Amino acid sequence: PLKPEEHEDILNKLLDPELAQSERTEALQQLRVNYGSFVSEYNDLTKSHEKLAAEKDDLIVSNSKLFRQIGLT
Amino acid sequence: PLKPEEHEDILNKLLDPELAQSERTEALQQLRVNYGSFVSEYNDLTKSHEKLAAEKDDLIVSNSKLFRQIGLT
C-alpha cells in the first residue's frame, strides 16, 4: 500500500550511515509491516483470481460445447 | 516478488550500523527494484481480476442463452 514515493523516502532515510539506531530501526520496522501487509493483500487477490479463473475455464469449455450445437442446427 | 523470508533478510542486514556504506546502498536498491515490480504485478493483477470478473459473468449469461437456444431447436 505504501506509494512507491513514500516507500522511496524511507529507502532514502536508511542511506545515512550516521542515522540514529533508534530511527533506522523504526524505518526498517515500517518497511517490514508494510511489506507484510502488501504480500498479504497480493496473496488474496492471487487466490481469489485463481478461483475466478477456474470458473471461467469451466464456462469456456461448457459454452464451446454448446456453441458447437448452435452450428449443428 | 521477493519472498517474505528474502525481504526479512535484507531488513536485518540493513539494521547493522556498521554495514559497508557501498553495500547498504546496494541492498537498499533491491528494496526499490523489488518494490517497483511488486507495485506493478499488483496493479496488473487488479487490472486483470477486474476484467476476469466481468468476463465470468458474461460467460454465465452466454451459457444461459446458448442452452435455452438449443432447446428451441
B13: CATH: 1.20.5.400
Choose the mutation target among A66, A67, A68 for the interface with B, i.e. most B CBs under 10 Å.
A66
HSE, side-chain direction, 13 A CA sphere, residue A19: 21
Closest CA to A28 of A42, A1, A7, A5: A7
- Strand locations in chain A (E): none
Which chain B residue is nearest to residue A60, measuring alpha carbons? Answer: B59
CB-count exposure of residue B48 (10 Å: 0-12, 13-18, 19+)? middle
Q: How far apart are CA A2 and CA A73, in angstroms?
A: 57
Residue with cell 522511496: A8
Q: How far apart are CA B29 and CA B35, in angstroms?
A: 9
Q: Report CA dihedral (A21, A26, A29, A31) to the nearest 10 degrees.
A: -100
The DSSP symbol for A16 reads -
Residue with cell 511488486: B38
Experimental technique for the deposited model = X-ray
Print burial letters for A37-72: b (CB count within 10 Å at least 16), e (below 16): ebbeebeebeeebeebeeebeebeebbeebeeeeee
Q: Which three cell numbers stand for residue A48?
A: 481469489
Residue B54 to residues A25, B40, B58, Cα–Cα distance (Å): 44, 21, 6
Q: How many CB atoms lie within 10 A of CB B20?
A: 11
Q: How far apart are CA B35 and CA A1, in angstroms?
A: 11
Choose the mutation target among A22, A45, A50, A60 for the interface with B, i.e. most B CBs under 10 Å.
A45
- Cβ-based contacts under 8 A for chains A and B: 86
The DSSP symbol for B15 reads T
Spell out which residues of chain B touch residue A70, defining contact as CB-CB under 8 Å: 66, 69-70
Q: How many CB atoms lie within 10 A of CB A24?
A: 19
Q: Which three cell numbers stand for residue B19?
A: 554495514
Q: How far apart are CA A22 and CA B64, in angstroms?
A: 63
Cβ of B32 within 8 Å of Cβ of A8? The answer is yes
Q: Which three cell numbers stand for residue B54?
A: 466481468
Domain range holding A57?
A: 1-73
| Counted domains in chain B | 1
Q: Is the dihedral of CA B3, B6, B12, B18 positive or negative?
A: negative
Report how far Cα B70 is from the mean position of its chain's Cα atoms. 41
